[PDB]
């Protein structure tokens, strides 16, 4: 994926995580959470179902067209039908193949995004009270329990509060 | 009081997953596909929301020129006419120069309306029967159609005409009769030479009969060509014989519809099915499909591959 | 003293913005988008950069033969011919076995130069005229076209040749007469049976003509078949007939133009589009069309939708 | 957008903008500005017309072609003519529709990319200078006057002047 | 003591560099590309994996037939029939109605082998040849056809049947003679005017002979024309005549393949190449080609485009 | 390229690379450096490779085909006979150019995002002790030699070890 998150900075996904598709496991001094966030699954969703939609959308319909089944052999304009008739499978089965291909390659970067979208956000939400690991985590350098994760999780995390006390613990020799 | 806090993002991960195509990748593993190719049908044709009418053993053809067995079928109407393949012919032996065409003109048109005209017969024995062709009790012959022999022992120059004083198109189904023997041909027709001329004041056609033994088929050698003619309004069709001419009785009405004809062994069923293939009736939800390149109705796009996946999920990147 | 600073980023709005179709969105506001469908025309035919010919009253057919109200036509040159739909034929009555295809091979020449040759014609009376054909005063006949009755009362077996002694293709327009009687037939052409045989080297064709009556077209139940061949270089033309031949006068040229033909009513102006329709001159700065599917020129792909927006900016999001 | 940032962490845009497609609203000690960016503007103009030119190219260009319309009813042939040109149609009905979808969904990410290029590219010009708030603003822990904006704005901000003053204004308790 | 680092990340550039086509850049430099399209030819056919055969101086007809200097041809089998342009006919003249199809049915067929069935003749003489088709010393005719002429000075009425007892279609190929002048169509075939009909039970042909002159070919004004009839498993083959007739001596057979024919000058070779154009074959490690329209195997799309370079490195920004 | 790295804030590529396709040059106390990243490179080559495999992938293959070169004029049969090779030559030949223009844009997106990926990388293993100069250069805020180097191109460097001497070098009036 584009943006390297999914199967990327992120090494695996959560078979635990059945409430959806994108979310935070914590670990504080209170103990563990783990909730899936909704405005990132839900972007991910609309859009794959957006998509679904357009490619299921009804194609065209034809009714009385020529025949494509023979019992005899009559030469030139028979040659003739059989080439269109295959000619024209030929090139849906080219747009069938490369729509998926397309699609998928797609739909694959998007949730990608998504997922670093859902990142970006709360590393900018946490200002200077938190450090990026690496591997998708964040250290919080202040005390922050699941009432505090919480805030983070629904987007109301105020970081002058704990700014003094995480500032200063982020700097000690 | 002195501590930190640690805080992972994530994603979701399934035990099972699924292979899919992307760009840069044969196979990779994604968390969840659906299949874009409708590959299955249930084998049998649904009666909804298209017209179909089953020709059991008639062919539209034999329905058109009223092989006797197939007499349920006058006047009759289809979105789709479905010819099953133990389709028999009853009736006089016959054959039709481009078969094909009439065959799809007259499937398209999807009716069998056949308006009886008073043509007249100046000095000819009409409504010949056969053997070959039985009508209950005694013999008989296509319902749409007059074989005219001789009066007497003359028989004369045909002349007649029937003009198009109507606002829609005419079709006229009419033929050619060709003897076994020189000896047949002179004991209905007379002159040993017959001819028949059918036109429009845009075109025409002539076909000269030809005597000779054909094979064995209902016990006769003879034959009868079919040949067919369409008026516009305004136009005239004339007739022009001095033997061998197989007299329509009427024409058939046109439509121009979306109506036509499927070979298919399907049995037909009660339910709503939008899509049809000879196969049965396959759902549409899809859009694409593999049963069969021959479909009629609104249907998914007939392509080579059986499967199809579309990713409706992220990559799965398991534990 | 001390106090920061604010540096906010941002992208423009709009306060109207356009719907537009994407992968994800069946519709989605951008900032501006242009039409990549072309689907009005002016509903005349520019006079440029095609060579237009204007058949006003005259098939390409009639222009062909010689009608004699198509006389301005002779050896006339186009990119396209227009056919209108007020066109008339006024000669003798006549028809064409694939007349689709004449009118394709002429309208591909895109020519009507045709060159006299020094046809023989022993024992037999040429320039056979009609009051269906009128040519000012008098009565005439097809311009391109030689009608061959009897000497005395003979009609000898003809038997000509003429080969292509040149380097480019001859095109040969002939014809067969088909009269009403058997009476009509013996005072033109003597043997009441007459007969046409037409061949190259390569190939042959024989007509034999068909007596009796068709409708009145100009007060005439009589007919003309019309029949064309090809003569390649190096190649003969060899015409054989005991009756009921239409002479040709020579051949017509031929070319493999980028010309062709077009049915229209639209008015010819002064001015220059490539792209030609039916409808009349297109644009071609779009790159799809849903005019007409019958295009000439270098033209927009035909298409079935009449929409088709292509973002030319940003995702548009509003105060 | 696969970035994230028009109608992401952009909330929304700028009806105001006349001058340009991507610029900087400010608030300072001296007053207000505001100036659209003209690099990352002419960067997704001349893509869009990059683009724009690839589709207008003149395609193909035919002459006498198979008949399509019929006065007469004529069978097999007749059919053969017009299945032909309906599948043809059809073909290009998909690739006109297909292409619009692929072409708009890029113009899309484009412009979302070229406003996420302008805000790193910024991001990285203040160095330590500076905070993101979230909302694509950053606070400039500074004094930074009209002419200190513009500097920013030309590409000729010098952090090391500044550091001094806004790393102390950034630690303070 | 006081030291700083700096860590740059980069990537290549190369001093060359290509030009490539994308979505927003009509060209625009990479760091390298392959070509996708297949655009020049090894000049000559390799003699794998395909069964080639090189018709040299015979056409596909003339070698059916039996042409006498195609007598190499009897029986052969192919995937491609090579036709040269270097092939003459030496045979009597003649000419095929719908030459086109006969030409592609029997190259799909894919092979020769011809069945000679114990026909039987009553009262005609067989085996009539002509110096126009010589055969070694003595004069001759065409292998797989027999040219039937009167018995001492009778032609009776030619009715005879083949009936298909087998579970493979038979393919009958047979004629029909036009005489130059009376004088000659008496003197083989008795009856002024001769007649061919040939039949199966589901369908018929009559053919009526022409007499008259065509240009000299061979020395010849006379011509044959060449039909043909397949005949279904448990059907009948009917042939009747009263003069005029080039009967067939038996049978081909029918195979449904791959095989097929195309026009080629090139020298055929030593190697192995799948994909075969009349250029000669060319690699498919494309997928697509703009050698030829016309090809031959597993191929590369044909394409107009000579270029289309698919990139395989990033951008190229040089120092 | 969407994320501006490439022909971005990277101003210019490395004629000199040849080991690879991304990589490292460096300027510490102990001299000069310069190495390709494998990964990276690696993931670049794969991913180009499995496209173009997905574009060589053996297309179909016919047989008896129509004819398509006549030495006649015909008419009607022929006109059909041309325009239906004339319109599926059409459709191929915008297959073709349609394929390598999203196949190129794609691939040089692709590359450009690897860059990327390399860089937030190396960002993320450094932590606190660099800051981005803004032409994709860190500032090793401490003493860093060769082995250290290297450290950092492996993978395996320690941000803890040079913490305290980079963030206090870091901060000095
Ligand atoms: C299939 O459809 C066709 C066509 O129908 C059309 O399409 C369908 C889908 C519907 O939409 C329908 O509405 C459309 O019309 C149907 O074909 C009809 O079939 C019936 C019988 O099945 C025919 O009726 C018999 O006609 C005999 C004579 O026919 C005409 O010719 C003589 C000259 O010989 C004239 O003198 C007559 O007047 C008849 O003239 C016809 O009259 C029609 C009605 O006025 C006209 O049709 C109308 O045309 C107009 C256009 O302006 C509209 O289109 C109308 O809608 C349309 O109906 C027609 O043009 C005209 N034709 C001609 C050539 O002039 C009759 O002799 C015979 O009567 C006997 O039988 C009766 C019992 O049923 C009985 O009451 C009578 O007394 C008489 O009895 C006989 O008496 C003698 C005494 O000596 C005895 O010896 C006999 O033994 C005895 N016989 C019997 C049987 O007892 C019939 O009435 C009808 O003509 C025909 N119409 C058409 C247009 O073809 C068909 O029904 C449908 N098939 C099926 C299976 O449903
Ligand atoms: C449309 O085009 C066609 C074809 O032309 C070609 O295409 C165009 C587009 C141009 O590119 C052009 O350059 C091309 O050539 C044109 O068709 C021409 O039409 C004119 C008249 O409109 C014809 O001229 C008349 O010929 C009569 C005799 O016909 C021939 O046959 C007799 C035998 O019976 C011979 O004895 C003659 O010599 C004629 O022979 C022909 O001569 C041509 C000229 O050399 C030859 O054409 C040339 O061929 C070569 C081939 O190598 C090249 O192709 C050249 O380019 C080509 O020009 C031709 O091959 C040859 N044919 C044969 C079979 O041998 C004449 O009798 C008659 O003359 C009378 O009228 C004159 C006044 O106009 C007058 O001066 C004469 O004295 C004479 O007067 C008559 O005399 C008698 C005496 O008894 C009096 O009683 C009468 O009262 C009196 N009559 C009149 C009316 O006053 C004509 O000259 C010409 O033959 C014909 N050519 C071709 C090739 O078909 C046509 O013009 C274009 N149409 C329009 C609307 O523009
Ligand atoms: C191309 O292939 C064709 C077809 O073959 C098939 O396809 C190929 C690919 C192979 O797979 C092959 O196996 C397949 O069969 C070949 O065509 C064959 O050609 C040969 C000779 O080249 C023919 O043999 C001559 O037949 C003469 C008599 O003809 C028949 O009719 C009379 C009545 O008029 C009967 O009495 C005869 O018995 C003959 O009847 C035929 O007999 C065949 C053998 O059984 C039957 O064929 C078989 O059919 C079955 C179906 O059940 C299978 O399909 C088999 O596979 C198939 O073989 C056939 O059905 C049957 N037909 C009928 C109608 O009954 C003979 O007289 C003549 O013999 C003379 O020459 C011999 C020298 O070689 C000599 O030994 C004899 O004694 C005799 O000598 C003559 O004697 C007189 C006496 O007075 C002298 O005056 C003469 O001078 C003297 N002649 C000579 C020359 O010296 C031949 O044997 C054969 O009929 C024919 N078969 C078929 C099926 O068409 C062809 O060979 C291949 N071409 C090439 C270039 O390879
Ligand atoms: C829907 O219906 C379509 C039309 O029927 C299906 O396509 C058809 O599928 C059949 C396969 O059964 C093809 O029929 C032929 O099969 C024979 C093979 O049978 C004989 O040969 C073997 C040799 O191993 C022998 O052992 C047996 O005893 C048999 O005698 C082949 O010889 C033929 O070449 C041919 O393949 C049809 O050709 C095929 N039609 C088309 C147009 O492809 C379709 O698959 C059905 N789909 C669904 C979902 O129901
Ligand atoms: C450019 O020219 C093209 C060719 O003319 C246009 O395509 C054609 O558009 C016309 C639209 O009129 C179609 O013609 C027919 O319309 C009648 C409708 O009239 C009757 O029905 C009403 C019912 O309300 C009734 O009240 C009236 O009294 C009439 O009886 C239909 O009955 C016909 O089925 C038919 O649709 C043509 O079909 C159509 N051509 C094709 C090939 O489909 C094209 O739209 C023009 N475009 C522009 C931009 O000018
Ligand atoms: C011409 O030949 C055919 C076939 O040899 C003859 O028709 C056969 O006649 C018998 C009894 O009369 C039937 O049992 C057969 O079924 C017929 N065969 C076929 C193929 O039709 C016919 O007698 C001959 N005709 C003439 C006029 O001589
Ligand atoms: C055969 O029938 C046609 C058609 O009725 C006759 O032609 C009509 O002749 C009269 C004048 O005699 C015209 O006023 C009519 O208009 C003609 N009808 C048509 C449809 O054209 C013709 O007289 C008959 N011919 C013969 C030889 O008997
Ligand atoms: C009809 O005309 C043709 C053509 O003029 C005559 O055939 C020519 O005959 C001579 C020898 O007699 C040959 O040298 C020529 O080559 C022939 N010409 C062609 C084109 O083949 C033929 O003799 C005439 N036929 C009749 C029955 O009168
Ligand atoms: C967000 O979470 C906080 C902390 O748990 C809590 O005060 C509140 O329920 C949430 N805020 C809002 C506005 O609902
Ligand atoms: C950038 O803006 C500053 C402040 O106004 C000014 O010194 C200068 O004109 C600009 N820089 C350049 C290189 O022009
Ligand atoms: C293009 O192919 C490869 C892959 O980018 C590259 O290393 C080389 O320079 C080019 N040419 C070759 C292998 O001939
Ligand atoms: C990484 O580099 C360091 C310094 O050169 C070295 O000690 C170590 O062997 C490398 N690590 C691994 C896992 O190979």
Redesign the interface.
């Known amino acids: 994926?584009?943006?390297?998150a999914?199967?990327?900075?992120?090494?695996?996904?959560?078979?635990?995580?059945?409430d959806?598709?994108?979310?935070?496991?914590?670990?504080?001094?209170e103990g563990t959470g783990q909730a899936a966030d909704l405005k990132s699954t839900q972007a991910?969703i609309?859009?794959?179902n957006?998509?679904?939609?357009?490619?299921?959308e009804?194609?065209?319909?034809?009714?009385?067209?020529?025949?494509?089944?023979f019992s005899?052999?009559?030469?030139?304009?028979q040659?003739?039908?059989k080439?269109?008739?295959?000619?024209?499978?030929?090139?849906?089965?080219?747009?069938?193949?490369?729509?998926?291909?397309?699609?998928?390659?797609?739909?694959?970067?998007?949730?990608?995004?998504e997922?670093?979208?859902?990142?970006?956000?709360?590393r900018?939400?946490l200002?200077?009270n938190?450090?990026?690991?690496?591997?998708?985590?964040?250290?919080?350098?202040?005390?922050?329990d699941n009432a505090?994760?919480e805030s983070?999780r629904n987007g109301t995390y105020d970081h002058d509060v704990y700014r003094?006390e995480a500032?200063?613990?982020r700097?000690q020799? | 009081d002195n501590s930190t806090a640690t805080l992972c993002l994530g994603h979701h991960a399934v035990p099972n997953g699924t292979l899919v195509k992307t760009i840069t990748d044969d196979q990779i593993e994604v968390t969840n596909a659906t299949e874009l190719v409708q590959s299955s049908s249930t084998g049998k044709i649904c009666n909804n929301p298209h017209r179909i009418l089953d020709g059991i053993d008639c062919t539209l053809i034999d329905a058109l020129l009223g092989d006797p067995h197939c007499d349920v079928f006058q006047n009759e109407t289809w979105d789709l006419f479905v010819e099953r393949s133990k389709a028999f012919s009853n009736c006089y032996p016959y054959d039709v120069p481009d078969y094909a065409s009439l065959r799809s003109l007259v499937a398209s048109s999807g009716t069998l309306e056949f308006i009886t005209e008073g043509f007249t017969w100046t000095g000819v024995t009409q409504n010949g029967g056969s053997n070959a062709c039985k009508r209950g009790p005694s013999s008989g012959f296509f319902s749409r159609l007059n074989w005219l022999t001789k009066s007497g022992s003359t028989y004369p120059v045909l002349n007649v005409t029937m003009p198009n004083n109507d606002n829609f198109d005419k079709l006229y189904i009419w033929g050619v009769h060709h003897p076994s023997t020189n000896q047949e041909q002179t004991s209905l027709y007379v002159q040993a030479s017959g001819r028949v001329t059918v036109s429009t004041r845009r075109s025409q056609q002539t076909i000269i009969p030809n005597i000779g033994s054909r094979p064995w088929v209902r016990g006769l050698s003879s034959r009868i060509s079919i040949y067919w003619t369409i008026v516009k309004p305004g136009d005239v069709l004339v007739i022009n014989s001095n033997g061998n001419l197989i007299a329509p009785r009427g024409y058939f009405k046109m439509r121009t519809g979306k109506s036509s004809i499927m070979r298919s062994d399907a049995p037909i069923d009660t339910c709503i099915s939008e899509c049809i293939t000879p196969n049965g009736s396959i759902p549409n939800d899809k859009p694409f499909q593999n049963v069969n390149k021959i479909t009629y109705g609104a249907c998914p796009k007939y392509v080579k591959q059986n499967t199809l996946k579309l990713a409706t999920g992220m990559r799965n990147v398991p534990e």
Chains 1, 4, 6 share one sequence.
């Open positions: 994926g584009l943006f390297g999914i199967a990327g900075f992120i090494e695996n996904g959560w078979e635990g995580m059945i959806g598709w994108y979310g935070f496991r914590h670990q504080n001094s991910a609309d859009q794959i957006g998509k679904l939609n357009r490619v299921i009804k194609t065209n319909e034809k009714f009385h067209q020529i025949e494509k089944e005899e052999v009559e030469g030139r304009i040659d003739l039908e080439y269109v008739e295959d000619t024209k499978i030929d090139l849906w089965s080219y747009n069938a193949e490369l729509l998926v291909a397309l699609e998928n390659q797609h739909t694959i970067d998007l949730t990608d995004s997922m670093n979208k859902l990142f970006e956000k709360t900018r939400q200002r200077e938190a450090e990026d690991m690496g591997n998708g985590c964040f250290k919080i350098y202040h005390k922050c505090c994760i983070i003094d500032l200063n613990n700097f020799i």
